[PDB]
Amino acid sequence: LVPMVVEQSARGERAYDIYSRLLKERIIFLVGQVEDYMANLVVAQLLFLEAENPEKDIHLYINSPGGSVTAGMSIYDTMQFIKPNVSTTCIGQACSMGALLLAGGAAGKRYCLPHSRMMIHQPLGGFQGQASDIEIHAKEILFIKERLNQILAHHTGQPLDVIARDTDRDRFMSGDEAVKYGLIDKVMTQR
Amino acid sequence: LVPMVVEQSARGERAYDIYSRLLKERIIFLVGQVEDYMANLVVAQLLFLEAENPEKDIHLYINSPGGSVTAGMSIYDTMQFIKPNVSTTCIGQACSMGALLLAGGAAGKRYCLPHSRMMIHQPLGGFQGQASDIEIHAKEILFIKERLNQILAHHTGQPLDVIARDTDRDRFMSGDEAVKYGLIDKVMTQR
Amino acid sequence: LVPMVVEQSARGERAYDIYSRLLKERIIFLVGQVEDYMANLVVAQLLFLEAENPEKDIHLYINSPGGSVTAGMSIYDTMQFIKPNVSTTCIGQACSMGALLLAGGAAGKRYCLPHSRMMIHQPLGGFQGQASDIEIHAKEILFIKERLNQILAHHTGQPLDVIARDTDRDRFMSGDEAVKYGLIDKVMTQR
Amino acid sequence: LVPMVVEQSARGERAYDIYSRLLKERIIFLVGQVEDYMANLVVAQLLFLEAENPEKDIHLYINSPGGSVTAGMSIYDTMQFIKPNVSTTCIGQACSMGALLLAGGAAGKRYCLPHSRMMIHQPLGGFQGQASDIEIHAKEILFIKERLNQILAHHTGQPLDVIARDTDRDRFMSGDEAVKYGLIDKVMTQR
Amino acid sequence: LVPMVVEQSARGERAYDIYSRLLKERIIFLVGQVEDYMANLVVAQLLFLEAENPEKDIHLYINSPGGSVTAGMSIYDTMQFIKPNVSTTCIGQACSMGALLLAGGAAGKRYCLPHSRMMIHQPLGGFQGQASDIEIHAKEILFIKERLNQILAHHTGQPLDVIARDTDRDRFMSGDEAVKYGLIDKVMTQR
Amino acid sequence: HGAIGAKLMEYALKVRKVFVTGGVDEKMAKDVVQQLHILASISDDPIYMFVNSPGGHVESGDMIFDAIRFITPKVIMIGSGSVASAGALIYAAADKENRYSLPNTRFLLHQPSGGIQGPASNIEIYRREIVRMKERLDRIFAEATGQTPEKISADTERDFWLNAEEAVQYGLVNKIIVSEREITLP
Amino acid sequence: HGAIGAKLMEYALKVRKVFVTGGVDEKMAKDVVQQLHILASISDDPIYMFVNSPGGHVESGDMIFDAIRFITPKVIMIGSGSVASAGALIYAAADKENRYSLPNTRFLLHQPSGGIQGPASNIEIYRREIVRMKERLDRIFAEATGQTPEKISADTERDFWLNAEEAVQYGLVNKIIVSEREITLP
Amino acid sequence: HGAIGAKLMEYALKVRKVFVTGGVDEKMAKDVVQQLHILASISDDPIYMFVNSPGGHVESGDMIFDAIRFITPKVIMIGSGSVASAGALIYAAADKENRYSLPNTRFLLHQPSGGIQGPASNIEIYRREIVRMKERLDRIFAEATGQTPEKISADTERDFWLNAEEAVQYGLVNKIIVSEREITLP
Amino acid sequence: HGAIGAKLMEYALKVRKVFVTGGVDEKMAKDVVQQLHILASISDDPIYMFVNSPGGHVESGDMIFDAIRFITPKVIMIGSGSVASAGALIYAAADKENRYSLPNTRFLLHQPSGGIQGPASNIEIYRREIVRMKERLDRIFAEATGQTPEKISADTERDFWLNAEEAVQYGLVNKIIVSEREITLP
Amino acid sequence: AIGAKLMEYALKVRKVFVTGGVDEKMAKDVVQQLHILASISDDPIYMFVNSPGGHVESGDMIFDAIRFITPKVIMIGSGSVASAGALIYAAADKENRYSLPNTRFLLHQPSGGIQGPASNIEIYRREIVRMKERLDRIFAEATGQTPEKISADTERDFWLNAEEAVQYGLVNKIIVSEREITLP
């Protein structure tokens, strides 16, 4: 069950859930598989925080094993479009979309806990139909694979030939390895 | 059903649930299988208590049969990252993940009940795929197994060779046995 | 549906559920199969009442057919740890885990209804695996069995040899029979 | 959906559910199969009403097809234990466990509607296991059967051997027939 | 989703559900298959309205395909017991049990819509067991069938020999046909 | 599985030994009745019948009870394992002098049971049939055991279990045997 | 499944070797009993029975028990694998001198288990039958193992496993063998 | 499936070749054991056995294990595919000089596993049998491999896999072959 | 299926033709291997094998691979339809000069895949066996195709599909044919 | 038993019946009969095809098997034909390819499903294209039309009745009785 929290503001006492209280501090949580419904909540949260303070930074915690590519793109495109710098902090796992959203944070604001694990693999897809339909969908999944590799290269600075080579198979990277790779900037250890 | 409780503070009467009422006293509950959703709540609570009082001592009761390794790492890394000392009081059972959090508590603030059971086991994982994928995943789980052994060795103080040896098979330990092993510091019997 | 009750205190009228209203009077209900979730609620209820008045007794009603041993041990260890005297009243039936808490109540403050039925049997468990794993689990369940027998002997006063014989098979005990055995002190008949 | 009712008292307007409003007038509803969860609510309601007025009578409406014996025993013992007279009114149907609580009402305060139906049959139990366990459970169910028959003889006044004869097979009885048997006192027809 | 309505009383605005709002005007809805749970709600609603005003009429809208006989009889007996007349407007369809309540309304206050359909048949039932039990239950259902035929004869005014013939098989009756039969008194077309 | 039994039939038909094992259903009726009529066409020699069933369709049992009385050769009945209500009806089909039982045989006599669901009028018709069937079965065991029909109805109200020794006193079994040499042919 | 085994029945009848493998159910009893009566009709030569079962219906095991005693030829019992409660009953049917076991055989002797759902009066009837069954089986083993029924009941309270060597001292097995040449015909 | 197998079975008995393929279960034990005893009755000539199984009921393997030793003709074992724990037990039944293997063959030696549910007292009895089963299987492999029981227990703590070449050095396999001409009869 | 195949199997045995259609499982291996040993006993004449498999159990394919090499008559392999990892292993069993294919035949050479669930210690052992199996399967194709093992592993990283023409250049197939007259016997 | 019994006389008349979905089981049975009949004699073989579709890879076995054996196979189309049945239908020579009046034909592109990484999907896509190109080349040789014409018409389900099949070149002659068949 979600616990309740009391802010105890000067005007008076208010009761907010644990998640809503943190949202007041420009914090957004990404938990579970990425899908259209949960992804829409993140988009709404990002826009709302923008209006409250378009200058203050935002912190997006990412703990997900991946999910829908389209849902993830709606978040990534929203993070870059808005004015505030959306920080990113890995809290243990990012398989396919978690690393794209972890590496799509403002420069100097991508963190990772000491024992977090980050992976990167090519987008998986499933479709059935006629040969003509298969050829059409095959080109679409090949186009997406290229656009995703371009995003990582831009934020990480590595050449596209290396990204494509590393995304052919599942590649696990620790906190220290990710810094050299360019996925993140700093590894938070202690306060 | 969750019973409601009234604080009866100086300001007035406010109703809190049984779990939220204890949250004000720096207490967090870890019950059931460890998963991303429930583990994320513990993280949110730990961060909230930190801001409320970064000098007080937090208490974390653990009664769980284990769960996701990634979820446990998010809690362990969070406890060590924050400044406040996070006390642990094992009630009931504490399996592999539950034992790691119990051992990860602040020195001298780890407790267990007289009839508590603590079991340490190696990581249990499953995966299917080609030989190349199996070789990659096998290295990852072996890496995690080494890191977890180092964590227990650091807190317990036992050498790494003993941890790996005792974690090969299921090994149950009572309160008194845990104190000598180093998993805990004191066994609470009565007030 | 759970009905609503009004307290009508000096400050004013407050709406309390039927279960929470009794909790204000130091009353706790233990219903259904014993498990980590329901047992944790009892622990919080026992602790909460302790801070409100650590001298006033607590009444723990037990109507359950048993369940998990670890969850029940958390309740027993908590009752014996807290300073207040936890009274026990058997309203319905009392199974192996159910009767360990009934007997664990404060001396002279254990009760049972005239038509209440009390049973005590060996702990039930199951596990599958290699021969080495079975040998480990077999010793663990056997050890747990001894600890349970010792608890009954301590509260009932009967020698361990007799408890082991009566716990080998299911043995029902009526209100009058339990008094002679030592499981309880008095049988409530009428006000 | 449960409709809402307003008290419209002198203190002010308050919203009560349809069931809670009747509870203020010392009315309790027993609907559906008898089980541990619903029976505890009836117990909690009975105890609460006792404290409010230990002299005013309580009306328990019973419309149930039976259920658990242990759950029902807690209600019967609770009604007899408390000081206030507990009136009983049978609406719909009254099965063996249902009728044991109807006959157990205060003398002269047992009622039934004109088209109500009352039935009494032997207790139903199911158990599987070794020969030794079967012999133990057979004695337990037989003991409960004797205790149940003794309760009816006490409230109905009929000989014990007559009850056992009529309880061996299902025996339906109307309002008029029940009065002669002694299960009830009066049959309400109109105001 | 049940919509919300505002009463806008002198004391102030009160939020009421659509069903509870109509309940304030002495209106009760009997929708869906009849059962013990839904039928008890109608009983509680009927009794509550009785205390508020035992002289003002009550309007019971009925649209149900039938259900439990015992649950339905509790409603009929309640209507005939309480002093205030209980009008019965038949909307939609009214099967055997649904039509017994319609007939049970106050004389001259039974209505139905122009396209409403009323059907009556034998009380469906089933049971399995031994020959002795079958003969016992067969007499019970046969006895119940006679009680229902007498109820319809009393309100409709038709001889009992005709009811048994018309209830042997399913017989549909329109609003105009029902008036001649005696099931109702007037067909409401418009205000 | 049918092929093994099929091959064994060529040898089983020589020894004239019918086996009734398992629940009594419509399928069992065809196989058992077919074997009895086939054997009757070969010769009028006796037939040995082994009954061991936990119960089943009562109407199916009447086909076997009827066939035993229909054919000319005398059927030697040997009880084994458990003889339930449906199996006991088949056991009573043979003559008293031809009803044998093993030392550890069981006999259960209970009233028929069934289920009905529908209008009240349909239940009344079903009630009469269940009564006519119960009385019919009571008059069968009575003639075979010699007890009065009222005695059978009184005892069969509840599950009545009789061992091999008790059956001899009741009158259902004539003589208990342990070896085939103890059988006396007519 | 039958045509393969039926094709092997040609030579299986010549060697007179029955195989009791798997759970003891109604279908196996009808097949095993058929072979015994068939082989007995061909000649009175000994019959070799191999028992390996994890458990099964007790009533089904009573047909094979009496069937062995019913036929004239002596049945040589050879234990293999696991001899459960129901399988042990079949094993005890043979004479002590004719009871043989393999070196890695197991034996299990436990009280019967069952389930009952219904009124208390019906449960009392089931209780009596289970008690009589427990005493009936104990007498069978008490007679074969040369031990008092009281000792058998005390040891059969829970699962009582016995290896091949332990069974010899208990009196259940007469001699352990490894090759067919060690068998001595009566 | 009967007709296809039964047809091929006619010629299979002539060549004296048993194909132990699939999980070791109760049904396979009855068929394999039936073929072994039949072939032994025809003549004392050698029998060729091909084992390829992923494991299964260990008790069933004990039947085939002793059955090979029970009959007089020598059984030639030619392992194929994956010889699991239950399959390995059957592989050890043949004399060392008669144990052959193919080049791409695997051998898995793991301690027995099982599941228990119920009271603690019943679990204690199950624990003793599992320990006894583990010790019994270790001695069997020791006699066939020549290693000491302690060495086997240390190696069988987990899934111990061995290829054809590794098995020769371990003592489980005597010689690896690729064609039937490389087999030397005793 | 059984009876249907039996009529066709009788005439099919006379022409020494084996058809491998469907997934390669333990059941198919037992049936296919039985035909090879049976035909080998009749005469040393060649045997024609048709392979059409989308995959299956790898261990089952090994038995067929060794069996082809075990028997003396030369096996003529005619691939038809679609071949896979398990089917290709069976296809390589025949000598290069005896490996024929049809015009529309397809081939697939991919590394083996599997699923392991358990402790990390057990996964380490499973990892070793998968690696050894991959190396073992690469040397087999390298010998039949003539390519080095390193090239095989590089191309088999993912699903490597080959038509009839590409297979000839790769060295897996020797000659493509459309009629039986184009086959050259040794 | 019915099959085995009827198979005794079915081999004397040399009439194979292809009916139902083309699966792996059908290929084993149909291919066995063809090879068995060829060993008995070189006389013609009559094949009746009625299938709503099935596995295309199974059809290839029957396709080449007809061309592999020496006796000429007489193809008689009856009922409903599809991608799997049409492939088998095109295996016989035009002069030996007959049809019935109420027969239907269907020519559609092969369909399948794939799940996994993009790299694996690319490999699967290539084989689907090669398979489609191979089937177009097969029907083109039998119908006499260019592969482009087949591909354009096969873009969607192309239903051809008995009469339209003749104009398209897939059927040589429609017949109603065995007396109208002309052997080589």
Alpha-carbon gap, residue G164 to G81, rounded angstroms: 10
Give the chain B residue whose CA is nearest to the CA of I125. Answer: B138
Q: In terms of DSSP bridges, do strands A110-112 and A86-94 run parallel, antiparallel, or are they unpaired?
A: parallel
Chain centroid to Cα C111, Å, comes to 12
Amino acid occupying residue J52:
P
Amino acid occupying residue A155:
H
Q: Which of I85, I134, A96, A122 is nearest to J121 (CA)?
A: A122
Q: Which of D155, D160, D157 is nearest to D110 (CA)?
A: D155
Extract the tokens encoding D3. Answer: 């409709």
Q: Annotated catalytic sites of H, by residue?
A: 85, 110
Chains G and F touch (3+ CB pairs under 8 A): yes
Q: Are H80 and H102 in contact (CB under 8 A)?
A: yes
Chain centroid to Cα H1, Å, comes to 25
In J89-144, the DSSP E strands lie at 97-99, 104-107, 111-117
Chains I and J touch (3+ CB pairs under 8 A): yes
Q: In terms of DSSP bridges, do strands B110-112 and B186-187 run parallel, antiparallel, or are they unpaired?
A: parallel
**Residues from D in contact with E at Cβ < 8 Å:** 1-6, 12-13, 15, 18-19, 21-22, 29, 31-32, 63-64, 91-93, 113-117, 169-172, 188-191
Extract the tokens encoding H145. Answer: 């491999």
Q: In terms of DSSP bridges, do strands C86-94 and H175-176 run parallel, antiparallel, or are they unpaired?
A: unpaired
Catalytic-residue membership of J111: no
The 3-state DSSP composition of chain A as helix, strand, coil percent (nearest 5) reads 45, 25, 30
Extract the tokens encoding G41. Answer: 């009709």
Interface residue of H1, H58, H66 to substitute, partner G, most G CBs within 10 Å = H66
Torsions phi, psi for G21 (to 5 deg): -125, 135
Neighbours of chain G (3+ CB pairs under 8 A): D, F, H
Chains A and J touch (3+ CB pairs under 8 A): yes
Q: In terms of DSSP bridges, do strands E125-130 and F113-118 run parallel, antiparallel, or are they unpaired?
A: antiparallel
Helix (H, G, I), strand (E, B) or coil at G176: strand
Helix (H, G, I), strand (E, B) or coil at A13: coil
Torsions phi, psi for F94 (to 5 deg): -85, 165
Extract the tokens encoding I33. Answer: 């291997």
Active-site annotation holder among A121, A132, A137, A155: A121
Amino acid occupying residue F113:
S
Torsions phi, psi for D114 (to 5 deg): -60, -40
Q: In terms of DSSP bridges, do strands C86-94 and C110-112 run parallel, antiparallel, or are they unpaired?
A: parallel
Torsions phi, psi for E87 (to 5 deg): -65, 155
Quote the minimal CA–CA distance from J56 to chain A in Å. Answer: 13
Active-site annotation holder among D64, D96, D116, D155: D96
Alpha-carbon gap, residue D79 to B65, rounded angstroms: 42
Alpha-carbon gap, residue H35 to H12, rounded angstroms: 10
Quote the minimal CA–CA distance from A18 to chain B in Å. Answer: 7
Active-site annotation holder among E20, E74, E121, E137: E121
- Asked if C135's CB is within 8 angstroms of H115's CB, the reply is no
Residues in chain D: 191
Alpha-carbon gap, residue A83 to A81, rounded angstroms: 7
Q: Which of D167, D133, D138, D135 is nearest to D150 (CA)?
A: D167
- Asked if G134's CB is within 8 angstroms of D134's CB, the reply is no
Helix (H, G, I), strand (E, B) or coil at C14: coil
Extract the tokens encoding D126. Answer: 């199911």
- Asked if I21's CB is within 8 angstroms of J35's CB, the reply is no
Helix (H, G, I), strand (E, B) or coil at F177: coil
Closest residue to G80, CB basis, from H31, H63, H136: H63
Helix B36-52 and helix B69-81, axial crossing angle in degrees, nearest 10: 10
Alpha-carbon gap, residue A159 to A174, rounded angstroms: 20
Helix (H, G, I), strand (E, B) or coil at F127: helix
List, in sequence order, the alpha helices (H) in H71-119: 85-91
Chain I residues with CB under 8 Å of J7 CB are 4, 7-8
Q: Are D98 and D69 in contact (CB under 8 A)?
A: no
Torsions phi, psi for C124 (to 5 deg): -105, 135
Extract the tokens encoding D29. Answer: 């509803």
Which conformational region is residue C48 in: left (phi greater than 0), alpha (psi within -120 to 50 degrees), or beta? alpha
Q: Are B176 and B187 in contact (CB under 8 A)?
A: yes
Helix A69-81 and helix A131-156, axial crossing angle in degrees, nearest 10: 40
Helix E96-103 and helix E131-156, axial crossing angle in degrees, nearest 10: 40
Chain D residues with CB under 8 Å of C31 CB are 36-37, 40
- Asked if C115's CB is within 8 angstroms of D77's CB, the reply is yes
What number of CA atoms fall less than 13 Å from residue I34's CA on the CB side?
Answer: 23
Which residues does residue F50 pair with via DSSP β-bridges, in sequence order? F19, F78
Alpha-carbon gap, residue H16 to H40, rounded angstroms: 10
Chain A residues with CB under 8 Å of J128 CB are 131, 134-135
Catalytic-residue membership of E132: no
Does an H or E element contain D128, and which?
strand D124-130
Does an H or E element contain E101, and which?
helix E96-103
* CA quadruple H144, H150, H151, H152: dihedral sign: positive
Chains G and D touch (3+ CB pairs under 8 A): yes
**For the stretch A73-85, what's the b/e string if a residue is b when 16 or more beta carbons lie within 10 angstroms of its beta carbon?**
bbbbebbeebebb
DSSP string, E16-33: EEHHHHHHTTTEEEEESS
The residues near A152 (Cβ < 8 Å, ≥ 6 apart) are: A100, A103, A120, A158, A163, A183
Alpha-carbon gap, residue G124 to D138, rounded angstroms: 7
Does an H or E element contain F59, and which?
helix F58-70
Which conformational region is residue H118 in: left (phi greater than 0), alpha (psi within -120 to 50 degrees), or beta? left
The DSSP 8-state label assigned to residue F98 in this structure reads G
Alpha-carbon gap, residue H131 to H114, rounded angstroms: 11
Interface residue of D8, D35, D36, D55 to substitute, partner C, most C CBs within 10 Å = D36
Q: Which of E30, E8, E17 is nearest to E76 (CA)?
A: E30
Q: Report how far apart, in Å, the C-alpha atoms of E110 and of each of C5, E53, E90 are.
A: 39, 20, 8
Q: Are C183 and C103 in contact (CB under 8 A)?
A: yes
Alpha-carbon gap, residue I102 to I79, rounded angstroms: 6
The residues near I119 (Cβ < 8 Å, ≥ 6 apart) are: B121, B122, B123, B124
Give the chain H residue whose CA is nearest to the CA of I133. Answer: H104
Chain centroid to Cα G86, Å, comes to 6
The 3-state DSSP composition of chain G as helix, strand, coil percent (nearest 5) reads 50, 25, 25
Quote the minimal CA–CA distance from H69 to chain I in Å. Answer: 24
What number of CA atoms fall less than 13 Å from residue C168's CA on the CB side?
Answer: 12
Q: Annotated catalytic sites of C, by residue?
A: 96, 121
Quote the minimal CA–CA distance from H103 to chain G in Å. Answer: 32
**For the stretch G61-90, what's the b/e string if a residue is b when 16 or more beta carbons lie within 10 angstroms of its beta carbon?**
bbbbbbbbbbbebbbbbbbbbbbbbbbbbb
Does an H or E element contain F115, and which?
strand F113-118
Q: Are J14 and J44 in contact (CB under 8 A)?
A: yes
Extract the tokens encoding E50. Answer: 């009785």
- Asked if D172's CB is within 8 angstroms of E81's CB, the reply is no
Extract the tokens encoding D64. Answer: 């149930």
Give the chain A residue whose CA is nearest to the CA of J123. Answer: A138
Extract the tokens encoding J82. Answer: 């599809």
Give the chain G residue whose CA is nearest to the CA of D145. Answer: G120
Chain centroid to Cα I24, Å, comes to 10
Q: Which of I146, I56, I51 is nearest to I90 (CA)?
A: I51
Helix H120-145 and helix C131-156, axial crossing angle in degrees, nearest 10: 150
Closest residue to C44, CB basis, from B1, B18, B172: B18
Residues in chain C: 191
Which residues does residue B120 pair with via DSSP β-bridges, in sequence order? B171
In E11-123, the DSSP E strands lie at 15-17, 27-31, 58-64, 86-94, 110-112, 117-120
The C-alpha angle A16, A20, A25, rounded to 5 degrees, equals 115
Alpha-carbon gap, residue E100 to E55, rounded angstroms: 23
Interface residue of J34, J64, J126 to substitute, partner I, most I CBs within 10 Å = J64
Q: Which of A91, A102, A15 is nearest to B46 (CA)?
A: A91
Q: Are J156 and J106 in contact (CB under 8 A)?
A: no
Quote the minimal CA–CA distance from J146 to chain A in Å. Answer: 19
Does an H or E element contain D30, and which?
strand D27-31
Alpha-carbon dihedral angle through residues I93, I98, I99, I104, given to the nearest 10 degrees: -140
Q: Residues A56-59: contacts with CB within 8 Å, 24+ apart?
A: A56/A26, A56/A84, A57/A26, A57/A84, A57/A85, A57/A86, A57/A87, A57/A106, A57/A109, A58/A26, A58/A27, A58/A28, A58/A84, A58/A85, A58/A86, A58/A87, A59/A26, A59/A27, A59/A28, A59/A86, A59/A87, A59/A88, A59/A89
Q: Are G54 and G40 in contact (CB under 8 A)?
A: no
**Residues from A in contact with B at Cβ < 8 Å:** 1-6, 13, 15, 18-19, 21-22, 29, 31-32, 63-64, 91-93, 113-117, 169-172, 174, 188-191
The DSSP 8-state label assigned to residue I182 in this structure reads G
Q: What is the 3-state secondary structure (H, E, C) of I61-117?
A: HHHHHHHHHHCCCCEEEEECCECCHHHHHHHCCCCHHHEEECCCCEEEECCCEEEEE
In B56-99, the DSSP E strands lie at 58-64, 86-94
Interface residue of F10, F11, F158 to substitute, partner G, most G CBs within 10 Å = F11
Q: Report how far apart, in Å, the C-alpha atoms of C64 and of each of C90, C101, D40, J49 are.
A: 9, 11, 11, 69
The DSSP 8-state label assigned to residue B67 in this structure reads B
Q: Are I134 and I149 in contact (CB under 8 A)?
A: no
Alpha-carbon gap, residue F81 to G136, rounded angstroms: 13
Q: Which of E65, E56, E58 is nearest to E38 (CA)?
A: E65
Q: Resolution of the deposited coordinates, in angstroms?
A: 2.9
Extract the tokens encoding F182. Answer: 């103890």
Q: Are E4 and E17 in contact (CB under 8 A)?
A: yes
Chain C residues with CB under 8 Å of B115 CB are 73, 76-77, 147
**For the stretch J132-141, what's the b/e string if a residue is b when 16 or more beta carbons lie within 10 angstroms of its beta carbon?**
bebbbebbbe
Q: Are I15 and J36 in contact (CB under 8 A)?
A: yes
Q: Are F145 and F89 in contact (CB under 8 A)?
A: no
What number of CA atoms fall less than 13 Å from residue E152's CA on the CB side?
Answer: 28
Q: Are G147 and G141 in contact (CB under 8 A)?
A: yes
How many C-beta neighbours within 10 Å does residue J166 have? 15
Chains J and F touch (3+ CB pairs under 8 A): no
Closest residue to G3, CB basis, from H6, H26, H63: H6
Q: Report how far apart, in Å, the C-alpha atoms of C116 and of each of C94, C177, D153, D159 are.
A: 8, 11, 20, 25
Quote the minimal CA–CA distance from A161 to chain J in Å. Answer: 15
Amino acid occupying residue B117:
R
Give the chain G residue whose CA is nearest to the CA of H120. Answer: G158
Extract the tokens encoding G59. Answer: 């009533």
- Asked if C131's CB is within 8 angstroms of H113's CB, the reply is yes
Helix (H, G, I), strand (E, B) or coil at A5: strand
Torsions phi, psi for A176 (to 5 deg): -70, -45
